[PDB]
Amino acid sequence: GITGTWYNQLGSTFIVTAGADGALTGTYESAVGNAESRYVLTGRYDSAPATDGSGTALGWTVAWKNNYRNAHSATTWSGQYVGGAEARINTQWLLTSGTTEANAWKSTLVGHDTFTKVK
Amino acid sequence: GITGTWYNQLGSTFIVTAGADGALTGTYESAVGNAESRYVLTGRYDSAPATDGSGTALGWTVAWKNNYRNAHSATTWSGQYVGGAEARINTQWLLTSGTTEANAWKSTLVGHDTFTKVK
Amino acid sequence: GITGTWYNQLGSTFIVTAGADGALTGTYESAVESRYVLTGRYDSAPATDGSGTALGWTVAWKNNYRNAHSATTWSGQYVGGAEARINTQWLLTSGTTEANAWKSTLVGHDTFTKVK
Amino acid sequence: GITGTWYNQLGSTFIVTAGADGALTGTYESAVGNAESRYVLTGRYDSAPATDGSGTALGWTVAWKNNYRNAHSATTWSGQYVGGAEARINTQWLLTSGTTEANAWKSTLVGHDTFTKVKP
Ligand SMILES: O=C(O)CCCC[C@@H]1[Se]C[C@@H]2NC(=O)N[C@@H]21
Ligand SMILES: O=C(O)CCCC[C@@H]1[Se]C[C@@H]2NC(=O)N[C@@H]21
Ligand SMILES: O=C(O)CCCC[C@@H]1[Se]C[C@@H]2NC(=O)N[C@@H]21
Ligand SMILES: O=C(O)CCCC[C@@H]1[Se]C[C@@H]2NC(=O)N[C@@H]21
């Protein structure tokens, strides 16, 4: 279900494996921002979700440092997987940059990403 | 400086190891919510932060399922670690519960936690 | 371009008047009677480089018929053109006791359009 | 207890009047960001809050344009007033800047401000 390759509305690529233990592991490649190529992600998901039609809660983190570039920032996505004919992961995210203490008020962006397995 | 035990303002306990590769691994024990005992956490941090006084960006996820309870929800914390004698991890968080599609509008809580080395 | 009736994807409606001073006034008709006062502000002199027009408004969920002891603010931007939109993120805070304040605020997003 | 002069943890000044109709009016002066002097605010608050010890929900908006400066941005604060012993307004806020469509993903900052009546 969750395991596979997903794309968000920006064209970013989220390759994830959902482990039986509730673990999420994989790579994220952002189409935007101070990022290039793949970054490691790790996360957790509800491996025993409700059976009443509710989505599956999940979250994951990317710290935007790889072998090529370091943005000194990290994003967490929090959301739920909705299965079915048109599988989607609906997320909201927080991106925090490292700042000085005086600039901490503007450290964190918020947004929302929707992932499907298409394009 | 990140590795060790941290406590937030609500009385929750965050036990974490910061790996050399940027991995965060540990356990979270929540003082509030549909939670009981320890939960696995995983996350990522900037393992090569700026040397200009900026904090160290980081994030982690807890899915609120363990051997004792399943809240069908997951929280991600996004923030930065700030060193010194009064070291802190300042975070904002998103808590998404699994919902049906009709209730997705109320799926996600937002808040902020500050973690310190002493409590 | 802001003044008029807008519809979200959830069947809510709001009618707003954008005053020359930057004021937003109108009524929000929810879906998830149900009309509530809305007030807000918008940038009355936006950039002319294709940037959106920043704006925000608040609705306190009390009227003559019910009171949910809560308030939503929407923060976003108006984007003009053929498919005009107001893209928003919102925060809904409910009145809680201090012990429950950690769970007082929901966050989401809404997109409003001039059609349907 | 909402009406008065409030200051947040940054030293910003929030001057507000709560109208009997649920209206919030006043001025906001930010200690940080692309802002100078006072800006108009408007908002709403629950004028018949619960009597069980719960706070009073409220929210307000500032568009960061005044006679001196225009940041092409607007902030909304959503929060609750908590009386008793030491009056406080605890908020979370969203600051949206006007952006191109390509830059809309980075349009919105989020944070939290706590206000008390204690001058810096
Ligand atoms: O610019 C930076 O600091 C690092 C790049 C972050 C890109 C952000 Se993550 C939330 C949003 N979703 C996405 O795919 N890319 C953007
Ligand atoms: O109630 C649930 O769904 C699981 C428990 C959630 C606890 C939340 Se995580 C954000 C906040 N910080 C904390 O330590 N506990 C609360
Ligand atoms: O349940 C309540 O508190 C009263 C109705 C709240 C409606 C919320 Se405002 C954010 C979201 N957008 C919308 O149109 N309706 C929901
Ligand atoms: O920089 C801009 O775009 C306009 C100024 C925004 C200042 C932000 Se509003 C949230 C935070 N609280 C405060 O008092 N000032 C800052």
Residue numbers in the entry:
A (entry chain A), B (entry chain B): 16 to 134
C (entry chain D): 16 to 47, 51 to 134
D (entry chain C): 16 to 135
From the article:
The method of serial femtosecond crystallography (SFX) has pushed the frontiers of protein crystallography at X-ray FELs through the use of smaller crystals than typically used with conventional sources and the use of the unique time resolution afforded by X-ray FELs131415. For SFX to contribute novel structural information, routine de novo phasing from X-ray FEL data is necessary.
Here we show the successful use of single-wavelength anomalous diffraction to solve the crystal structure of streptavidin bound to a selenobiotin molecule to 1.9 Å. LCLS was operated at energies not previously available, delivering the 12.8 keV X-rays necessary for the work. It has a low ratio of selenium per asymmetric unit (one selenium atom per 128 amino acids) and low lattice symmetry (P21), meaning the measureable anomalous difference signal was quite small. The introduction of the sample using the coMESH injector allowed for relatively low sample consumption (<15 mg of protein was used during 18 h of combined data collection time). The coMESH was compatible with the moderately viscous mother liquor composition of 24% PEG 1,500 and 20% glycerol; however, it has increased background, and the associated fluctuations in the background level added to the challenging nature of the data. The measured <ΔF>/<F> was ∼1% at 2 Å resolution. These challenges necessitated the use of over 300,000 indexed patterns to achieve the successful phasing of the structure. For these reasons, demonstrating that the data for such a challenging system could be used for successful de novo structure determination indicates a good possibility for general applicability of Se-SAD de novo phasing at LCLS.
